Design an enzyme around this catalytic site. Sequence first.
Site, short mmCIF file in Angstrom:
data_model
loop_
_atom_site.label_atom_id
_atom_site.label_comp_id
_atom_site.label_asym_id
_atom_site.label_seq_id
_atom_site.Cartn_x
_atom_site.Cartn_y
_atom_site.Cartn_z
N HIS A 220 0.78 -1.19 -0.03
CA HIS A 220 -0.29 -0.19 0.15
C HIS A 220 1.35 1.03 0.35
CE1 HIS A 220 0.86 -1.21 4.28
NE2 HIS A 220 0.36 -1.90 3.82
N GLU B 242 3.80 1.80 7.25
CA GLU B 242 3.25 0.86 8.22
C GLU B 242 4.05 0.18 9.48
OE1 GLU B 242 1.27 -2.93 7.25
OE2 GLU B 242 2.13 -4.42 8.80
N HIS C 52 3.12 17.01 30.60
CA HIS C 52 3.94 17.44 29.56
C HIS C 52 3.30 17.62 27.78
CE1 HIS C 52 3.00 13.54 28.22
NE2 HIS C 52 3.32 12.90 27.18
N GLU D 128 -0.21 13.13 18.33
CA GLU D 128 -0.05 12.65 19.59
C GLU D 128 -1.59 11.60 19.49
OE1 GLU D 128 1.53 12.29 23.13
OE2 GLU D 128 0.22 10.39 24.12
N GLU E 184 2.07 5.55 22.87
CA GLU E 184 2.54 7.05 21.54
C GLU E 184 3.04 7.11 20.86
OE1 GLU E 184 4.67 9.09 24.94
OE2 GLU E 184 3.47 9.73 25.77
MN LIG Z 1 0.23 -4.68 5.15
MN LIG Z 2 2.49 11.77 25.41
#
Ligand SMILES: [Mn+2]
Ligand SMILES: [Mn+2]
Lengths: 375, 375, 375, 375, 375
Positions: free
Chosen positions: C92, C96, C266, C273, C326
């Site tokens: 694609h 990934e 923070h 994020e 995160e």
């Molecule tokens: Mn894939």
């Molecule tokens: Mn964070």
Amino acid sequence: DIPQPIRGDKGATVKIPRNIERDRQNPDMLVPPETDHGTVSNMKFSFSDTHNRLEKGGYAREVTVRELPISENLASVNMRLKPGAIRELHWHKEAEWAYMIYGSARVTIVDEKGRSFIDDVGEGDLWYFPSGLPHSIQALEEGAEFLLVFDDGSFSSTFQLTDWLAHTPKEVIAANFGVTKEEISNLPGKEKYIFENQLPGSLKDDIVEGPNGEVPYPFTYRLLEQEPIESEGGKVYIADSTNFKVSKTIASALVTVEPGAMRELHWHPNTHEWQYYISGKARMTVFASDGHARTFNYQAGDVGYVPFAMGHYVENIGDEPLVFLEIFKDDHYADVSLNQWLAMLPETFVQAHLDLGKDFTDVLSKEKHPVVKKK
Amino acid sequence: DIPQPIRGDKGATVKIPRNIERDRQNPDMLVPPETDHGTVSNMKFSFSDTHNRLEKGGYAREVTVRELPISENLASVNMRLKPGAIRELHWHKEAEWAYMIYGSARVTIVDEKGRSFIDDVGEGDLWYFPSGLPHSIQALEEGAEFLLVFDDGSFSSTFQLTDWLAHTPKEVIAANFGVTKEEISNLPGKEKYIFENQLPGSLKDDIVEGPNGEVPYPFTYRLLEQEPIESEGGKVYIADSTNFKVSKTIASALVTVEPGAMRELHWHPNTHEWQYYISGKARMTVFASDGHARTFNYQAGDVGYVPFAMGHYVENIGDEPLVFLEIFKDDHYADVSLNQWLAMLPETFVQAHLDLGKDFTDVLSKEKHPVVKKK
Amino acid sequence: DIPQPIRGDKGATVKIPRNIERDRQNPDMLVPPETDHGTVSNMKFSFSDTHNRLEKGGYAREVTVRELPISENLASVNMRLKPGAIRELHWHKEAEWAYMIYGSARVTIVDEKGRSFIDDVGEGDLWYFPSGLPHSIQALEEGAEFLLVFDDGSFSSTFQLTDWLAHTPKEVIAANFGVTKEEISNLPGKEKYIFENQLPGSLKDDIVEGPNGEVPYPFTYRLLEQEPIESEGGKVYIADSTNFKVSKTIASALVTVEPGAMRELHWHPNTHEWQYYISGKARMTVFASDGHARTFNYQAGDVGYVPFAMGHYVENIGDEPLVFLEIFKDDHYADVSLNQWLAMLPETFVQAHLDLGKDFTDVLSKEKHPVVKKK
Amino acid sequence: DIPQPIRGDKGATVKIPRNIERDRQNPDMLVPPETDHGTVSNMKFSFSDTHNRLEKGGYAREVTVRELPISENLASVNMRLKPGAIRELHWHKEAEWAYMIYGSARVTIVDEKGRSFIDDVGEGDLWYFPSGLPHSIQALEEGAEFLLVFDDGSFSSTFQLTDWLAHTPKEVIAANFGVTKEEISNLPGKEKYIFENQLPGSLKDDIVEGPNGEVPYPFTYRLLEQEPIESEGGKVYIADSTNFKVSKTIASALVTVEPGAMRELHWHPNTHEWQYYISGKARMTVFASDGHARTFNYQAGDVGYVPFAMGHYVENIGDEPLVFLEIFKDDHYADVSLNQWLAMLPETFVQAHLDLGKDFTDVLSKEKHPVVKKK
Amino acid sequence: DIPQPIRGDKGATVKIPRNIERDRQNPDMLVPPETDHGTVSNMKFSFSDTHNRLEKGGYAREVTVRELPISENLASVNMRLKPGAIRELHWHKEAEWAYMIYGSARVTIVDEKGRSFIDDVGEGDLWYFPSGLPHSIQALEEGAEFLLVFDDGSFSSTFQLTDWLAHTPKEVIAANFGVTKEEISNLPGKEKYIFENQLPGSLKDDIVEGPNGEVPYPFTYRLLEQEPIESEGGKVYIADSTNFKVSKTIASALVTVEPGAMRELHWHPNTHEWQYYISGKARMTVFASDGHARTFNYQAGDVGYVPFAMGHYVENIGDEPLVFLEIFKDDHYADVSLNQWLAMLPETFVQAHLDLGKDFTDVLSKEKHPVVKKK
Ligand SMILES: [Mn+2]
Ligand SMILES: [Mn+2]
Ligand SMILES: [Cl-]
Ligand SMILES: [Cl-]
Ligand SMILES: [Cl-]
Ligand SMILES: [Cl-]
Ligand SMILES: [Cl-]
Ligand SMILES: [Mn+2]
Ligand SMILES: [Mn+2]
Ligand SMILES: [Mn+2]
Ligand SMILES: [Mn+2]
Ligand SMILES: [Mn+2]
Ligand SMILES: [Mn+2]
Ligand SMILES: [Mn+2]
Ligand SMILES: [Mn+2]
């Protein structure tokens, strides 16, 4: 004869007035492969279907996003210059890449440090002008005809030297150069764009020396003097930023496919492909994921396109060599070959996918052959 | 012969491989009028340059915003049905207008009050289906070939009866109708779209009576049975919401221009014009303001476009009648004739504009003649 | 019990029918902190509120921009494979990134130079596949369940090997490989996507040698084998392009927060994020500037988000460890700690801002402790 | 004197080089009300800060979305014509509304049925030209200066009669009118736009009769001949589609505010307000919800704007009458008065909101007084 | 006197009420050069036409895309601080560049590794704060007035330390720092933004040592301590990422043009130019290609703009030095000089373009002189 949109027990004769000459050019569109499916954007446009701007000294016509809306990032001009004729000193926002199809020309460019580069370009040679650097083209004794590619699909205007001056107050031009208004009274009142002129002298007599040194990298490239990748059915010559060092935003391949051969099944993992068909006749199926695929026909004068990572092949469907350019807005050329991909996996894993056996996986090659010949 | 892009002392011979058949179709693009100027979007596309979807029973091909990006508000399908063949019961967001070019067909529509309308349509007849109302088409003994126009340029999919059912849980379909899952086990597993079928019987035996009454306005219109506006060089037949009452979002004119005649200089003060060329050969210059104008060639199978209020004319450049449709996304048809405009002003005021005298203002006509013949 | 949206003398009992189970999951949304204020976009979505695609061999469900519109740049799939089951060879546009939550799997990738990489991945290991490079996943004897993150929020389709082949003319496939149409007649007629298969053998027996050499950098990373940043209340493991070299467009941290602890106050100075909650229960307040802040609750199966540079903390509000990821579309991980920031400024300057004295500035630490424990 | 941005103990003297003349024009921007708060878009632009296009016969300058980006739906031109001078016969996509500030002019318009309207317009009179209908303006013996408003903020070009002709092939123009190319050889080679001409004769000698009848509704309106709404501090004259019948897309009010008076606190419940300040000096606070408000100063030559439904007032801050136009892209004028709103509610309900008593609710008036005078 | 928009036999006296003071500031807009042509966006805006935010300790006003819509990528604030006054500790998404016009200030910044930088900045010094890194400004004994430039034109809010804390639950703040809720009860309930404070002590007593080391590159730059490019009519001081190493997204030049001198005819081949006029009076013509050019006037307090690659010059039209900043969102400064460009080409090629002879090409210089003086 009279082609009809009939494939076995599907389709019907055309009963309305029609364009038979175009239908003959597009056999795989009037009668597509039964494997085509779903809505796919148009990936084909002819320079012959564009307005030709005629000037004293040549012509120019263009294929932009206004003609081929899939191609938002790349646009192209087919420009022709008569012997000695000049494409006026100019600049633009877009970087410019070029392929010399016919004849030869002298180019000039001056960079942002005041360093100049002047060179002659013949058939099979390239140039690349970085964004905003001013340049000119002048055809030599054969005249010249070339394809220009710009790295924005919205390309429309350029900044011309004489247009700038015609729209600057005469008192400012005079102040800029330390001359009187009378000394510049003969400046043209409008742009020239393309204009006739005497043949230039030898290249060596035009070279301009200056206090700022030589440009660090040349703006021209002799593509056809390089060693191509040679496979059974043809040849590929690649120029990108790894070899043609200044060409940062355009990567290119010139592909030749012999009669009975095809550019193999592949995709590009980096970006969209823009195509120009220099000569011959082709078909290509673009595979768009989710069961969508559409086949297009191309011949000399056509622009094609393959959106980022879509699967495709380019089949020569004529009796002469098929010659085309693959152009990418990127700092490198990259492809993934279907054959090589599967050859580099465990054979039983491939067999598990394809429901085929060893007799198939035995034919796969770990070496990439971009152009293959039919057995 | 071999046309060249040369106009007097401008232009040059083509030196690269080229598409001579397309150049011959586009004489006013290879060699434009010297009066053309500036960047104008592409206003021309051929159905022959599109993928043809072939089915058992006919075909369909389309020109959408993905092919002709100037046309954001209108898209079109050229659909062909063999005798008895059915375009499956379906609906869509877009309103649909149609012109029957060849043959005849039976249409059905049921409205949001459960009222049904079933009618036969022959050559020169129209239909209009309001947004979201479900309908079908079935070709009669000659088969049928027609142009469909949709009031969104992004048109791509339609909702098909059998596709809906194939994607609804069988227990829900069974509950919806009060039948068992076994009684609906033979439902198709995928859409039909276009399918072969026996010729229907007489229209009168198909008419369905119901408790909800007759539809208030018919969904078909006999355009060619109306009295046209007849001028020296041709005929115009107009259908909009003032006469074809249900046709709220599409206004249309069928124009016939004899050899040696032209659709006069005019514009539309209401909206964009979308064109389909049924037969013959044309040129049109689109005047885009600010000194921009571009000339296009058209022939049978071509779609054209004229953005809102741009000045234009359509000249027959062949030896047969030129026949085309002018389509507008509006509740009425409107034009301003250049001739009539100037005829309705004081003659000295017109003379002051044009730097011409009484010998010119004397030729102006206060009556509108949409199609004029060359003297 | 039955929670009510009442905070002191504000709010009221719910008088309409309601979703009590969801209200119990969202205590800080039914009864927000009095410090929340203003319009803030939704920053929370559950995989349990998505359609699950079931296949022979496993399932997949996704959270994209169509579910969580704040997350325009990142989308995610939760995929499960039974023992031996295969996620079909595919590619694609999107890069990934993956985290193996349960079990283990074998991955393959072949690069644009025809170099192959095959490796086994267990719990706590990562992979990263650059855009457009083709790959596969096959679960080993435990099966596998993993989170995939793609670097475009619009992620919807992938290009499958058998789908490409099913939509390519058989004569072209045959020409591509030098085989007859009969030899490929058993190719699947549609994609497989996820399919059952026998357990593979040992990794060492699958390794494929080839003429093009070893890939320069591995596509897998053993995250939990690294030394974490350990603070009083938990652990952080970071993988970005500085340590996981191929991972150019995704930076990641696995955070564990003990009961009674919190990911400190923070922000991230580089980009947005995206969060996935692997286990436990959290609350987070997002501070959006200009006096806007909104608190969200999260638990296992939830996706969260924090737009670029917004202030936040993640508090464990349960009795088990809180474990979350995160994720950043960037070449590095970066954070600014509120504590460390203020500790590195002159104490009287900080006091002048906060209207607090030495007893406060004395607690500040010049060392960053990403996870703090309540006293 | 030298104003400074100081309000009590807030602000400071300006220490850098500055524009004192502009600061003096903008006292409520250099020193805003303490009640202003938050980010609000610019709602003010001067015609004096625009390029003036000078021609033989007058000038034109414009304020568009390119100058005032909040005003996406409305743009304006200030045009001046010398005695007898002509604004060339032209048309455009946009509807055009006009207010004659100085002098007088003759206008022509011909509609889509070939009906003509010719009329003289003096100070305080309006015109409105529906989209796409062609028109002209010619100043009479005093010359003329007027404000034009167009119902698109992107307004940039118009279609000129002589520009169209200069970009149409001569053979087509000749065919269109039944004349030879020689008879039209004196057509201008470029547009005129604005040009000098002799004073026209009496209006009655210009009226053109034709076969298509009288236009159904006049394109001019005598605004200042109507009875205004008169309140203590000024006058309001309204023209919208209810009285000026053709004016479908523009509603307008001319407001006069005596020294010491103000256009009361109000909003418009229908659409955005665009303002032109004909004479005097004003301030206005725009209340944007969510605690956002910003105060602007205006004087003769300024354009202002009030986005849909924002609260506002217009205070005369000078010693002469303040005269301005309120323009709306709608088929009617509508306002809600703060005073009248509260007067029409139960007095104790109003008291409960405002924390004020009967002494306040006793002053409210159930009658709307658009312009109030200070006590 | 009273200027009028009259240029020879073009234009006319102003007959409506007008802004004479603004007309006097804009002589080349009321009466443009006859060489100006076509629609060009507004490239000029004054800080005096903006709302001034007054606080205890100073003021701030801004020019953003909401005022000057051509400038989508760059926005600016003019901020003034009284002696000792503090611009509150804060951060934002945008990178920030600054020029100290008056006085001096102390800045703090702490990076994402917890390294701190504290420094004093005087007149002619710069700072640059990378995106998201938190910082403060405190004026010293003279106070301070400076221009801030942000690398997004949509700039509107910043994240303030005390605003974050006021919108975080007190129990979370207490947990974050290991203190009780009582110990933080005196935290401010709302932001400070700008606030009065005592003068700080010596810089050396503020320097904070820490465990994480020195920042690798300083965040301030002494621009006026560098050697300028000196030409006949003025001086240019350049700071970009090649010399001011941290300044990755902003390149800058401070230009001084003596009376009777001009910044020469040039363009920038890399990106758009944003301008601030510190002192003096200028005019500039922007050449936009395709025969479009528009002239603007500027003086102290004005923002200007030149879109990417447009041709321009900046002429001092007053009796004092003209001092302005040229700002680019790029990692380097680059220009192409018209003079140097033509000097580096063959003289007969230049003569062929300009229709001028050796007497012109003899004046060209191969050396770039950014600022030229009138002879
Ligand atoms: Mn894939
Ligand atoms: Mn964070
Ligand atoms: Cl060009
Ligand atoms: Cl259809
Ligand atoms: Cl997937
Ligand atoms: Cl106008
Ligand atoms: Cl700020
Ligand atoms: Mn070029
Ligand atoms: Mn390719
Ligand atoms: Mn339909
Ligand atoms: Mn028309
Ligand atoms: Mn007009
Ligand atoms: Mn109002
Ligand atoms: Mn800042
Ligand atoms: Mn510059």
